[PDB]
Design a binder for this molecule. Structure first.
Ligand SMILES: CCCCC/C=C/C/C=C/C/C=C\C/C=C\CCCC(=O)O[C@H](COC(=O)CCCCCCCCCCCCCCCCC)COP(=O)(O)O[C@@H]1[C@H](O)[C@H](O)[C@@H](OP(=O)(O)O)[C@H](OP(=O)(O)O)[C@H]1O
Ligand SMILES: CCCCCCCCCCCCCCCCCC(=O)OC[C@H](COP(=O)(O)OCCN)OC(=O)CCCCCCCCCCCCCCCCC
Ligand SMILES: CCCCCCCCCCCCCCCCCC(=O)OC[C@H](COP(=O)(O)OCCN)OC(=O)CCCCCCCCCCCCCCCCC
Ligand SMILES: CC(C)CCC[C@@H](C)[C@H]1CC[C@H]2[C@@H]3CC=C4C[C@@H](OC(=O)CCC(=O)O)CC[C@]4(C)[C@H]3CC[C@]12C
Ligand SMILES: CC(C)CCC[C@@H](C)[C@H]1CC[C@H]2[C@@H]3CC=C4C[C@@H](OC(=O)CCC(=O)O)CC[C@]4(C)[C@H]3CC[C@]12C
Ligand SMILES: CC(C)CCC[C@@H](C)[C@H]1CC[C@H]2[C@@H]3CC=C4C[C@@H](OC(=O)CCC(=O)O)CC[C@]4(C)[C@H]3CC[C@]12C
Ligand SMILES: CC(C)CCC[C@@H](C)[C@H]1CC[C@H]2[C@@H]3CC=C4C[C@@H](O)CC[C@]4(C)[C@H]3CC[C@]12C
Ligand SMILES: CC(C)CCC[C@@H](C)[C@H]1CC[C@H]2[C@@H]3CC=C4C[C@@H](O)CC[C@]4(C)[C@H]3CC[C@]12C
Ligand SMILES: CC(C)CCC[C@@H](C)[C@H]1CC[C@H]2[C@@H]3CC=C4C[C@@H](O)CC[C@]4(C)[C@H]3CC[C@]12C
Ligand SMILES: CC(C)CCC[C@@H](C)[C@H]1CC[C@H]2[C@@H]3CC=C4C[C@@H](O)CC[C@]4(C)[C@H]3CC[C@]12C
Ligand SMILES: CC(C)CCC[C@@H](C)[C@H]1CC[C@H]2[C@@H]3CC=C4C[C@@H](O)CC[C@]4(C)[C@H]3CC[C@]12C
Ligand SMILES: *[C@@H]1O[C@H](CO)[C@@H](O)[C@H](O)[C@H]1NC(C)=O
Ligand SMILES: [Ca+2]
Ligand SMILES: [Ca+2]
Lengths: 240, 26, 288, 268, 283
């Protein structure tokens, strides 16, 4: 039974992988129903486990809850297609994460499980660091709106990476942190304030942004990676 | 979508093919 | 040195060179020379350039006086036994020759290389730093202790350079496509595969991640050949560019990562040192 | 076998182990000296004569091991260790290439050209011959073996993002050279460009973006380009300016799609 | 209530549109009306807290940041003195008052800042690497990017895209009808150049971040020649970008190793071990 369910997921994973831009009509006709049958079978195993073990055992398990979310999420997408035709998110591909239980038969289960256990245990911290990172992005976004908010209306058009509105400011700040074209954005900031002759003092804002942003991301995500992985190693060895 | 050989600014990202070149043209 | 023989003149001279006024005088003298190099700007008056060249002569003269002063007290043999003194001796020779060739002039202008010796004076500050000098020395020594790890990365560039030379060598760069085809081909006269060194430079540019995806697109099939390629059709470039660039990016990143970890874990004692616990750094201070 | 002892004397001798190690070095340098542009260049003709010598040395080294060690007859055999197969591939490719060049030089350039690429494996034969380099090579393989578990999770997550991206930007990455004409049937004829101090006319073309999301393979390649950091702002702009399938772009249509790339960056 | 006020202020700051020249969206007036209320409630909070503490108000660092916000806010709100537009910029730091309000985030911010103190020594070394390369670049590439192709005898650029040129064969040569001329604005509208020591430092810095260093190299090749320019940029990237990345990872790795073995962290891990053992036994 456990292997059969995993085998069904692989076929379901295959079906969503086949979809491409210009599919033959028979293939499209096959998929439209095929998602319905797969939804039924994965809803079928929902009920047989619901009755065989009982309702209270079902909710206690985390894997059963995860499968419940995918099933409910799949239900939302099916009805949403009729309501607003035009887009489909393919939520059913999130069931491919159930293929990670194949590691149970292998000897890699202990190391991977402890990594998850450590990550879930230190969930209060991980949320806190990400929130602190968000506030630092927000502050540098609001600062950009004060300095460069209204002066990207150039004679060649307003750049997409402008500081006019808040959603535009966040993306511009986020792009600088990743370091892609941070110099081109800085050139716009300098040109917006009189060019090289009178606007080279505004280059400091981008220098501080990329210098701190580059190393703050390193110090936040490597600290998470090193500490949680290190807990997994010692916890795994102590089990052995 | 500016055509090839037209003056371009890299931050625009509007260039039809590739990106805004070194010399400032698509 | 400590000769205890000539207390009348040599010891009086020797006590002067190793004396707090002397080291700070040289320390300040470098810092002033550091400022002088930074005072150059475009469009300056002829008097300003005249001022800067005069300052350079004064500094190198004093540094030459510094060298001749030290050799007397320490001795000719003892002067050449320390790397820093050799470094000081190399710099002063370069500074003198650079000025001499300039003021004579009226000859070949190839030797602007000697002007680098003026900037080399900056490295002398690193002797003063206690923490920075240790940090650089330990890591630099680690690269010496691991010569073969750098050889593996050199093989990666060597293999990929030769492959690019043969598969993508014949793509045409001579054609200038004005409002036709695409001049925006990233394979230009600066970013071509036409020779081994230019193939290496393109790989290094892709290693740093500078629009490598556009280079990958430019190397696909259907690109014009070269006039001397022997092919008169638009049949140059291969679909192998998808595997070539994608595999290179992953392999180059992985090999540098192993190089980084190898150096880090060679000095993992230094990086995890504790001041309360005895270590080699305190042992070095003991000898001092 | 008395004749086998003769080859083992040659193989075990130091002057045959060190000597080829230079032959590897010279052959690698000769590879880097070839002129890629002009096959009839004088440099290429002379370097070709050298390649005959390098194959002769490698062929001589291949056979004596075949006499020395049984091919598949023992636990230790010629075709037992990968490096010997790697040696086999290099010499075999050269011999096959020489045979086909002979029948008609002009007629089949493509294969001739194809197996000649296999000569690039000559540097890789140094790893076995240098004991110190093999230890570093084994260290890299050990590092690869340790991160294999996370790697499988990595593709599985990136595969999921590729499938999701496919179902959101499938066929919505078509643009017209003239932005005014949204649909394909309209994009025919001539249209005017107004660049500074000139007016010129060009064709209208219905084109797909260079990096798009049409199948799971194209999605993975585009997401790899995003992950490495190059050109992802343009992919973001094409994503937010996508209207419908088989329809041209309209600026600022879906600014909510920026959430897809933000979540992508936090994960991979 | 104070925390809710901070969140509302953050929302109000996030709901503002900036328009070019002097144009203002109609909602701007309604947004501005809220500022007196928020500054007043913050000042009331500060006063009620300071009278109790007795001014241990300034002793705590977070209270100082809250205090300076109130002074700047009340300084510009009362009256329309001069421009005082700069005194609006300090409102950017108001989102950071969430950290002061929530004690759970102050502990987290301590951990992040503790690990970056070792990186300060690396930053000093990084700065000295930029200065050496900036000085070298200042000596060799000084004013070389102010020479493009002009019409022969006419002070007008040949085309809509000017490019660096040279008067000798190794550099790029102007076409037949055009001559290289003493002055041109320069690449990237003159921002990228080696003219002062400040411009050299800025130009070297973006090469350290490995962004747009190929264009500078290719421009330098056109202006002077490709024979020697690689010796300045390739060592710059390796020493600047890769070597410092090696140091930063090493220093951070050592700090994380020492952090894990502190007594406080060991007890937390020991609790995790015992809880998992109980779960295994209970299972
Ligand atoms: C942080 C910035 C960006 C991070 C987000 C990006 C990406 C997210 C993080 C990615 C990093 C992932 C690293 C490695 C992840 C997986 C490797 C192998 C997966 C893995 O470890 O297996 C599972 C998750 O299984 C899934 O369904 C698959 C579902 C995946 C779960 C992983 C996500 C949770 C991590 C939270 C991350 C922190 C947020 C963890 O197993 P588990 O920890 O759920 O174990 C329970 C538990 O031990 C129960 O006692 C037991 O019995 P039942 O309750 O009766 O079922 C079961 O024990 P076993 O573990 O012995 O079966 C499990 O049900
Ligand atoms: C933290 C610690 C920091 C460590 C710092 C490390 C610093 C390393 C950086 C090395 C600096 C290299 C600088 C080279 C830049 C070259 C600039 C240039 O424009 O070269 C061409 C130019 C000659 O052209 P011209 O117009 O006549 O002269 C105007 C300039 N005065 O200029 C010239 O006259 C030539 C330039 C000479 C420079 C090199 C000459 C010899 C180099 C040794 C050769 C090494 C092997 C090279 C391969 C040989 C190639 C044939
Ligand atoms: C080494 C084996 C593997 C190494 C791996 C190490 C990791 C990667 C290291 C970075 C690789 C980048 C090295 C770049 C080499 C030079 C690049 C370059 O731009 O050279 C141009 C210059 C002239 O170019 P070219 O067209 O060949 O000459 C025209 C007429 N001869 O060509 C020259 O004049 C350069 C002359 C000597 C170049 C190197 C010495
Ligand atoms: C877990 C893994 C091992 C699953 C197997 C891999 C699939 C995710 C990949 C492998 C090759 C892919 C196929 C490669 C090429 C095509 C052709 C493509 O068809 C066309 O290009 C035109 C079709 C038409 O017009 O009829 C449709 C998608 C498909 C089958 C791809 C679907 C996805 C496939 C099956
Ligand atoms: C770094 C290690 C691996 C050694 C370096 C190998 C290559 C970088 C060197 C070795 C020999 C060099 C070659 C030796 C001689 C020449 C001829 C020289 O003359 C020409 O211009 C072509 C001859 C002609 O015009 O007929 C041009 C450079 C070239 C190909 C050299 C290019 C660079 C080469 C391949
Ligand atoms: C380190 C991590 C945790 C911080 C990442 C910041 C995100 C929380 C930001 C960055 C980009 C933001 C998005 C940028 C653009 C938009 C579109 C915009 O929604 C609209 O429909 C606005 C219409 C328009 O702007 O034309 C506002 C929400 C959203 C999804 C933003 C939501 C918040 C996002 C994801
Ligand atoms: C194995 C796959 C991911 C390909 C490897 C690509 C490498 C070259 C990519 C993947 C992740 C990327 C880094 C991850 C994110 C950061 C942190 C940011 O502050 C600066 C850019 C930087 C440093 C990126 C630069 C390039 C990078 C290291
Ligand atoms: C160690 C500290 C105190 C000294 C460093 C500052 C010096 C070296 C720097 C900083 C300010 C710089 C000046 C700033 C502006 C100009 C005007 C310009 O038209 C020519 C260059 C010139 C004159 C610069 C020369 C170098 C300069 C004087
Ligand atoms: C193969 C071994 C020797 C490695 C060394 C290769 C280098 C040093 C040698 C080997 C063959 C040589 C070439 C042989 C013939 C010619 C044609 C002549 O008109 C110009 C020089 C040129 C192009 C030589 C350049 C140098 C060269 C490429
Ligand atoms: C281990 C490594 C060296 C092997 C990789 C080499 C293979 C995968 C690559 C390298 C050179 C490539 C070939 C080079 C020559 C041609 C002739 C051309 O008209 C069609 C493509 C074709 C056939 C290429 C296909 C793929 C190819 C054979
Ligand atoms: C961590 C693993 C499970 C990855 C799965 C999460 C990814 C695929 C999910 C999480 C949040 C999701 C986004 C949430 C909201 C929207 C807005 C909607 O109008 C278009 C899709 C889009 C942009 C979603 C795309 C898919 C998305 C990025
Ligand atoms: C360009 O100038 C050269 C001078 O060497 C001359 O021989 C050639 O005919 C000129 N060509 C044109 C098109 O002016
Ligand atoms: Ca980058
Ligand atoms: Ca870049």
């Amino acid at each position: 039974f456990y292997w059969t369910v995993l085998s069904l997921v692989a076929l379901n994973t295959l079906c969503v992988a086949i979809v491409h831009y210009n599919q033959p009509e028979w293939l499209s006709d096959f998929l439209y129903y095929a998602e319905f049958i797969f939804l039924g079978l994965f809803m079928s195993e929902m009920f047989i486990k619901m009755y065989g073990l009982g309702t209270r055992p079902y909710f206690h398990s985390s894997f059963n809850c995860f499968d419940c979310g995918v099933i409910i999420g799949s239900i939302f997408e099916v009805i949403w297609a009729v309501i607003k035709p035009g887009t489909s998110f393919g939520i059913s591909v999130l069931r491919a994460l159930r293929l990670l239980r194949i590691f149970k038969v292998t000897k890699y289960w202990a190391s991977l499980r402890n990594l998850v256990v450590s990550l879930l245990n230190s969930m209060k911290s991980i949320i806190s660091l990400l929130f602190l990172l968000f506030l630092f992005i927000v502050v540098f976004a609001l600062l950009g709106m004060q300095l460069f908010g209204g002066q990207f209306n150039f004679d060649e058009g307003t750049p997409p990476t402008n500081f006019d509105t808040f959603p535009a400011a966040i993306m511009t700040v986020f792009q600088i942190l990743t370091g892609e074209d941070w110099n081109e954005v800085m050139y716009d900031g300098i040109k917006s304030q009189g060019g090289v002759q009178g606007g080279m003092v505004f280059s400091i804002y981008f220098i501080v942004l990329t210098l701190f942003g580059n190393y703050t991301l390193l110090n936040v995500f490597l600290a998470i990676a090193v500490d949680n992985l290190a807990n997994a190693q010692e916890l795994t060895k102590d089990e052995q | 979508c500016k055509g090839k050989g037209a003056p371009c600014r890299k931050t625009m990202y509007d260039c039809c093919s590739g990106s805004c070149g070194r010399r400032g043209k698509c | 040195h400590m000769p205890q023989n000539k207390q009348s003149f040599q010891y009086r001279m020797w006590q002067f060179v190793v004396s707090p006024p002397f080291e700070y005088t040289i320390m300040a003298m470098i810092a002033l020379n550091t400022i002088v190099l930074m005072m150059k700007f475009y469009g300056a008056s002829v008097a300003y350039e005249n001022a800067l060249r005069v300052f350079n002569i004064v500094f190198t003269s004093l540094f030459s006086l510094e060298c001749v002063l030290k050799v007397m007290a320490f001795g000719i043999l003892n002067y050449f036994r320390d790397a820093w003194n050799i470094f000081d001796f190399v710099t002063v020779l370069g500074s003198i020759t650079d000025i001499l060739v300039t003021e004579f002039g009226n000859n070949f202008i190839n030797l602007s290389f000697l002007r680098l010796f003026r900037a080399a004076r900056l490295i002398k500050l690193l002797r003063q730093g206690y923490t920075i000098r240790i940090l650089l020395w330990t890591f630099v020594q680690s690269f010496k202790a691991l010569p073969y790890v750098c050889l593996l990365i050199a093989m990666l560039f060597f293999i990929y350079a030769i492959i690019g030379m043969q598969v993508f060598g014949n793509i045409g760069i001579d054609v200038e496509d004005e409002d036709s085809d695409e001049d925006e081909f990233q394979i230009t006269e600066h970013n071509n595969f036409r020779t081994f060194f230019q193939a290496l430079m393109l790989l290094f540019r892709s290693a740093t991640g500078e629009a490598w995806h556009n280079i990958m697109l430019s190397c696909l099939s259907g690109k014009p050949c070269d006039k001397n390629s022997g092919i008169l059709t638009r049949e140059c470039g291969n679909e192998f560019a998808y595997f070539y660039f994608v595999s290179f990016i992953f392999l180059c990143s992985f090999l540098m990562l192993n190089l980084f970890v190898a150096v880090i874990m060679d000095n993992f004692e230094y990086l995890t040192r504790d001041s309360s616990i005895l270590g080699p750094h305190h042992l070095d201070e003991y000898v001092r | 076998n008395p004749l086998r002892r003769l080859c083992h004397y040659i193989l075990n001798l130091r002057y045959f182990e060190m000597c080829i190690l230079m032959v590897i070095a010279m052959s690698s340098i000769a590879l880097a000296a070839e002129d890629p542009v002009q096959p009839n260049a004088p440099r290429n003709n002379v370097l070709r004569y050298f390649d005959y010598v390098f194959t002769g040395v490698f062929t001589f080294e291949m056979v004596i091991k075949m006499i020395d060690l049984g091919l598949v007859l023992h636990q230790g055999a010629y075709f037992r260790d990968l490096w010997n197969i790697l040696d086999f591939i290099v010499v075999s490719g050269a011999l096959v290439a020489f045979a086909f060049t002979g029948n008609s030089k002009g007629k089949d350039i493509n294969t001739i050209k194809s197996l000649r690429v296999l000569r690039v494996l000559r540097p890789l034969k140094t790893i076995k011959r240098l004991p110190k380099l093999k230890a570093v090579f084994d260290c890299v393989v050990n590092s690869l073996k340790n991160v294999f578990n996370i790697l499988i999770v990595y593709m599985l997550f990136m595969f999921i993002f590729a499938v999701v991206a496919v179902q959101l930007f499938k066929g919505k990455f078509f643009h017209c050279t003239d932005e005014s004409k949204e649909f394909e049937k309209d994009c025919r004829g001539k249209y005017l460009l107004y660049e500074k101090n000139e007016v010129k006319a060009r064709d209208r073309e219905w084109k797909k973006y260079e990096f798009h999301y049409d199948n799971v393979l194209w999605a993975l390649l585009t997401l790899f380009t995003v992950s490495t950091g190059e050109g992802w702002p343009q992919v973001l702009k094409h994503s937010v300016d996508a209207t419908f399938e088989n329809q041209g772009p309209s600026p600022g249509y879906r600014m909510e799609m920026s959430i897809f790339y933000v979540v992508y960056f936090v994960v991979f | 209530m104070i925390l809710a006020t901070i969140i509302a202020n953050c929302i109000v700051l996030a709901l503002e549109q900036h328009l070019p020249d002097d144009d203002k969206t109609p909602m701007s007036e309604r947004l501005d009306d809220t500022e007196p209320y928020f500054i007043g409630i913050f000042c009331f909070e500060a006063g009620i807290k300071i009278i109790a503490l007795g001014f241990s108000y300034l002793r705590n660092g977070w209270n100082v940041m809250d205090f300076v916000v109130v002074l700047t806010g009340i300084l510009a709100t009362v009256g329309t003195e001069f421009d005082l537009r700069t005194l609006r910029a300090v409102r950017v730091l108001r989102p950071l008052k969430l950290v002061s309000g929530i004690p759970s985030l102050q502990v987290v911010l301590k951990s992040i800042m503790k690990a970056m103190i070792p990186l300060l020594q690396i930053g000093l070394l990084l700065f000295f690497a930029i200065l050496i390369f900036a000085i070298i670049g200042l000596e060799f590439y000084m004013g070389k990017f102010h020479t493009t192709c002009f019409e022969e005898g006419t002070d007008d650029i040949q085309g809509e895209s000017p490019a660096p040129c040279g008067t000798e064969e190794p550099a790029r040569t102007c076409p037949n009808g055009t001559k290289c001329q003493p002055y041109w604005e320069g690449p990237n509208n003159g921002i990228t150049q080696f003219d002062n020591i400040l411009f050299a430092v800025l130009t070297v810095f973006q090469c350290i971040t490995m962004e747009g260093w190929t264009d500078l190299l290719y421009n330098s090749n056109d202006a002077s020649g490709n024979t020697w320019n690689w010796l300045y940029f390739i060592p710059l990237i390796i020493i600047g970008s890769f070597f410092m990345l090696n140091l930063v990872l090493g220093v951070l790795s050592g700090e994380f190793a020492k952090e894990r073995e502190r007594v406080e962290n060991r007890r937390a891990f020991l609790k995790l071990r015992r809880q998992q053992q109980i779960e295994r036994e209970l299972n």
